Design an enzyme around this catalytic site. Structure first.
Site, short mmCIF file in Angstrom:
data_model
loop_
_atom_site.label_atom_id
_atom_site.label_comp_id
_atom_site.label_asym_id
_atom_site.label_seq_id
_atom_site.Cartn_x
_atom_site.Cartn_y
_atom_site.Cartn_z
N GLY B 10 0.83 -1.19 0.00
CA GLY B 10 0.00 0.00 0.00
C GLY B 10 0.87 1.24 0.00
N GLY B 11 0.28 2.36 -0.40
CA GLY B 11 1.03 3.60 -0.43
C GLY B 11 1.32 4.11 0.97
N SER B 12 2.20 5.09 1.05
CA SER B 12 2.55 5.67 2.33
C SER B 12 1.32 6.29 3.00
CB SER B 12 3.64 6.72 2.14
OG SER B 12 4.03 7.27 3.38
N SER B 13 1.21 6.09 4.31
CA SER B 13 0.09 6.61 5.09
C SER B 13 -1.23 5.90 4.83
CB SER B 13 -0.08 8.12 4.85
OG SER B 13 0.94 8.86 5.50
N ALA B 14 -1.19 4.79 4.11
CA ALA B 14 -2.41 4.03 3.83
C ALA B 14 -2.86 3.33 5.11
CB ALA B 14 -2.17 3.02 2.71
N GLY B 15 -1.95 3.23 6.07
CA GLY B 15 -2.27 2.60 7.34
C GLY B 15 -1.73 1.20 7.55
N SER B 17 1.28 -0.04 8.81
CA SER B 17 1.87 -0.33 10.11
C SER B 17 0.85 -0.46 11.22
CB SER B 17 2.92 0.73 10.47
OG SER B 17 3.65 1.11 9.31
N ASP B 37 10.12 0.38 6.61
CA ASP B 37 10.65 1.19 7.70
C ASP B 37 11.80 0.51 8.45
OD1 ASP B 37 8.80 3.37 7.41
OD2 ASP B 37 7.27 2.16 8.43
N1 LIG Z 1 -7.83 3.11 9.21
C1 LIG Z 1 -7.34 4.28 9.57
N2 LIG Z 1 -8.16 5.35 9.76
C2 LIG Z 1 -7.63 6.53 10.13
N3 LIG Z 1 -6.33 6.82 10.35
C3 LIG Z 1 -5.53 5.70 10.15
C4 LIG Z 1 -5.94 4.44 9.77
N4 LIG Z 1 -4.88 3.56 9.65
C5 LIG Z 1 -3.86 4.31 9.96
N5 LIG Z 1 -4.17 5.62 10.26
C6 LIG Z 1 -3.19 6.66 10.59
O1 LIG Z 1 -2.53 7.05 9.37
C7 LIG Z 1 -1.19 7.50 9.64
C8 LIG Z 1 -0.36 6.93 8.73
O2 LIG Z 1 -0.60 5.50 8.63
P1 LIG Z 1 0.53 4.42 8.78
O3 LIG Z 1 1.75 4.99 9.43
O4 LIG Z 1 -0.06 3.19 9.36
O5 LIG Z 1 0.80 4.17 7.25
P2 LIG Z 1 1.76 3.27 6.54
O6 LIG Z 1 1.10 2.76 5.33
O7 LIG Z 1 2.28 2.28 7.48
O8 LIG Z 1 2.98 4.34 6.07
P3 LIG Z 1 4.45 4.16 5.25
O9 LIG Z 1 4.10 3.46 4.00
O10 LIG Z 1 5.07 5.54 5.08
O11 LIG Z 1 5.33 3.37 6.11
C9 LIG Z 1 -0.89 7.18 11.10
O12 LIG Z 1 -0.94 8.45 11.79
C10 LIG Z 1 -2.00 6.23 11.46
O13 LIG Z 1 -2.35 6.27 12.83
MG LIG Z 2 4.51 1.13 6.83
#
Ligand SMILES: Nc1ncnc2c1ncn2[C@@H]1O[C@H](COP(=O)(O)OP(=O)(O)OP(=O)(O)O)[C@@H](O)[C@H]1O
Ligand SMILES: [Mg+2]
Ligand SMILES: Nc1ncnc2c1ncn2[C@@H]1O[C@H](COP(=O)(O)OP(=O)(O)OP(=O)(O)O)[C@@H](O)[C@H]1O
Ligand SMILES: Nc1ncnc2c1ncn2[C@@H]1O[C@H](COP(=O)(O)OP(=O)(O)OP(=O)(O)O)[C@@H](O)[C@H]1O
Ligand SMILES: Nc1ncnc2c1ncn2[C@@H]1O[C@H](COP(=O)(O)OP(=O)(O)OP(=O)(O)O)[C@@H](O)[C@H]1O
Ligand SMILES: [Mg+2]
Ligand SMILES: [Mg+2]
Ligand SMILES: [Mg+2]
Lengths: 178, 178, 178, 178
Positions: B10-15, B17, B37
């Site tokens: 998934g893309g960055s910030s998609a959630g 982690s 990461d």
């Molecule tokens: N389902 C959700 N609804 C709302 N906010 C969410 C949800 N899942 C994650 N977040 C929030 O979104 C932010 C970014 O998500 P997260 O760090 O999980 O993304 P990621 O895909 O792991 O990022 P990256 O690809 O850069 O490592 C965090 O602040 C997290 O708490």
């Molecule tokens: Mg991640």
């Protein structure tokens, strides 16, 4: 008229810090952010093991002693003095004592123009985010989700159960008088 | 039959982690989590300034050189060997190269039983969360929200635009064969 | 007589934060710690990309604009007000402007009883620790090791080149009047 | 001949991670770093509250159960497989079981060319650094300072009591065969 300080109140994992970072990005003028996390960070590590310090139960409970209060009080006067000196301040806190906690803050802000913000979130949803945050002691979010708002008066209320942080930030920013 | 490895894309910030930490809590057996990461964290800091290392543009762009790939490849064989040795592994990655990235992973996993998970999220929503996370370089979330899924095949797809991390974790956990 | 505030000055990687945490542990009464790190943390992330904000050069240089100063100034009055209200405050800062920086602090503290501490460390040694800290931008430690002390007057001076943080903390604590 | 893996052993706060980051900077080829910190980070948070997981006593003690060992073992085979695949690996660990711990590692590395490094530090000095690090549970450094080296055989030994991390890194790098 001009808003000098913004005070957010909500249970753990309600999404306060996310909203605060969104507000700092959204609001045109620079806003300084301080809260329960930064205060504890600034306090001696031993305060978390002290007599009348702060204690986090294994079940998510929280106890605050007089040692902790004494410092927090001086700290509160300090952030207010910062606002009085011209710094725009955003404070995110957890009103464990409900109305009593808001009253304590009122005693410090005096007639300073403050924007009181309530940040609500469904208990079960907050609990889930608590788990997602990975490292958080389980149980805090559920315990604080509702009681921290009892008898508290707000100028604006946002609910993160179905609204993104950036969206709540837009709603709050609209009540900020330049 | 038994799922040995779970790979999230998934893309960055998609959630991702957040979902991973929820899965580690939900799934009964202990699952080891590694991803983009932790890899970057394990790589020399200078890899982020190197020739054919990794480079984060100021606008959210990302460039990966051969130096970075060489290591990532050896690392991939390592996590697979961990699974082969009996460790349940969860991997969260960003398939910048779309299908090509999935193919690269396939070359390493061989016939290992893998659960391919897609984690989607609206670009604008992801961008907001990026801002909320406070410290993230702006622009990455929007740039990666859609292209990383082009031609990628999943066993399960979750969309965090309107679903909590814990909820997506439940959906994913249901496809995990004990 | 009674020391109300302790102000540490030293270049990056000189070991200030380590000394501060040792002091918080050693000193019997609770001391609140704030510094350049917590201030920047409290300031909007965009302050690090702003006009007259703060800018970290790729070679370790640092530029501070009026936007940053305005806030820092209000913040300084705030920490002083905290001390005035009874909170024992420890401040760790980097006097980039040498004596001028100390003078700026003097304008805020007034007649408050302050303990001025100098934290020196060999430039090359500080650079090594900078690398060891892993993530630090290279070049800052060497650049700040000496100039930040030019014309600065201290009540106590500690040198971490051959002394542990806890040892420097003992030396400093001895000059703290209860 | 060519060194494939570097394994550092030392008590908590002995300065291992600092040395590792210095080595990654010093060594010309890219070295991947993994250790006790990254493993625990990768393991489910609940592993720290589990039956036969890992438990940190309030006095600095550490207990490891079979659940934790099972995973660590698979993880060990994984890092070795990474080296076998061509990735240069640096491992920093704490041999709580002394020689037994080294033997366990030997069973995994086989005939892989490994550079065994011992990182010593005076117990009281390590304790001080533990306090300086701010957040560390007190008591671990003193408890592990000596026993983790009993019966352990090294190719190189560095002592951080009076030597900087970068200096120990230079000493270690000299024993690394390209
Ligand atoms: N389902 C959700 N609804 C709302 N906010 C969410 C949800 N899942 C994650 N977040 C929030 O979104 C932010 C970014 O998500 P997260 O760090 O999980 O993304 P990621 O895909 O792991 O990022 P990256 O690809 O850069 O490592 C965090 O602040 C997290 O708490
Ligand atoms: Mg991640
Ligand atoms: N509106 C939202 N929708 C979905 N997830 C959110 C939202 N706002 C915040 N989150 C996520 O919820 C988690 C916890 O929220 P956050 O840390 O902002 O809460 P908080 O109220 O500041 O906590 P505390 O009171 O303990 O300091 C984070 O992982 C964050 O990314
Ligand atoms: N006396 C000491 N001997 C050896 N290493 C030390 C000593 N004091 C601190 N260090 C180490 O030096 C590194 C950098 O020091 P530290 O972070 O305390 O510096 P600082 O002055 O607070 O930095 P900055 O000015 O950037 O905030 C850390 O890794 C720390 O553990
Ligand atoms: N040679 C040194 N001289 C002085 N301080 C040092 C030295 N090496 C490391 N330190 C400092 O000691 C502290 C603890 O060391 P470090 O975190 O490197 O230990 P570690 O062995 O990796 O710990 P753990 O085993 O718990 O993971 C840090 O604050 C670090 O900056
Ligand atoms: Mg908060
Ligand atoms: Mg500092
Ligand atoms: Mg370590």
């Amino acid at each position: 008229m001009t808003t000098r300080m913004i005070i957010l109140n909500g249970g753990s994992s309600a999404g306060k810090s996310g909203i605060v970072r969104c507000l700092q990005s959204v609001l045109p003028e620079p806003w300084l952010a301080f809260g329960v996390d930064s205060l504890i960070e600034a306090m001696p590590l031993k305060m978390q093991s002290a007599e009348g310090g702060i204690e986090f139960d294994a079940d998510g409970g929280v106890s605050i002693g007089p040692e902790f209060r004494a410092l927090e009080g001086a700290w509160a006067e300090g952030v207010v003095a910062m606002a009085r000196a011209g710094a725009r301040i955003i404070i995110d806190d957890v009103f464990l004592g409900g109305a009593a906690a808001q009253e304590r803050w009122r005693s410090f802000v005096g007639d300073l123009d403050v924007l009181w913000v309530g940040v609500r979130c469904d208990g079960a949803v907050a609990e889930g985010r608590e788990t997602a945050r990975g490292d958080r002691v389980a149980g805090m979010a559920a315990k604080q989700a509702y009681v921290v708002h009892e008898g508290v008066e707000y100028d604006v209320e946002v609910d993160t159960t179905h609204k993104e942080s950036i969206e709540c930030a837009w709603a709050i920013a609209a009540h900020v008088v330049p």
